[PDB]
Design a protein around this ligand. Sequence first.
Ligand SMILES: [Ca+2]
Ligand SMILES: [Ca+2]
Length: 276
Amino acid sequence: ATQSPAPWGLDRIDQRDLPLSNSYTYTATGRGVNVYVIDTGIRTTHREFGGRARVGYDALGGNGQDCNGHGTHVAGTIGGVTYGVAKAVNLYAVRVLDCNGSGSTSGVIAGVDWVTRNHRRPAVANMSLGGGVSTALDNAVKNSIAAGVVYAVAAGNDNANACNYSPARVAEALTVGATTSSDARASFSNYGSCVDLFAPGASIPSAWYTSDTATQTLNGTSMATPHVAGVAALYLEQNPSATPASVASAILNGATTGRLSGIGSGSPNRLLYSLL
Ligand SMILES: [Ca+2]
Ligand SMILES: [Ca+2]
């Protein structure tokens, strides 16, 4: 099916080169695959989700609904009917951050462990968050991936080496940096050898929590990451038996190479491509 016109980030990833086509083509929808958004929650009644969003877990005593905006926004780029890569996935809120988007690492780990024990295959988890080095968080994400869940995580927005952050530095997770519509590294994006690939992450429009119709445009590696989660869901729809290692390998081998500018030392020149 082809969506036209389309949000620029969707637009960019179904082609290798500029200029943008104002169209996003998809041969899969992620139907039947379960995406766990570990974030500030999700406004599940937002019209972008058409009943496909539900709450899985809330580490803060609440009901899993978003009161910040970020989780809803992220969920929309993954699976919203207009703003989403994979327009028919199942979305699950795993709420580990408060209305101000803050939370202890302990609560983040609680949500990662919940996904490990409660996910259903095929399963994708999105972590559009990051912080200083934490071996306990790294280990909980590695254990979740060993259990069979594909993880996409933000590289971080420090304009720094991504290996210095958790869970960005986990080798087994897909670690995602941000680019602009000119195919350059966004000026805030972390980079280097712990980054696995880049995806659109500046001026990304998606859903917001303040109403069932609200939208917002945002910048960050948190916005790049859900594009990659969405593509993992596309792949798993057609290959539901694939291990996280094989999914990562399909996306990285299929990635567009050589098109990016300013990506930094040690960074791979790889841009997400959806038509795997
Ligand atoms: Ca396009
Ligand atoms: Ca990684």
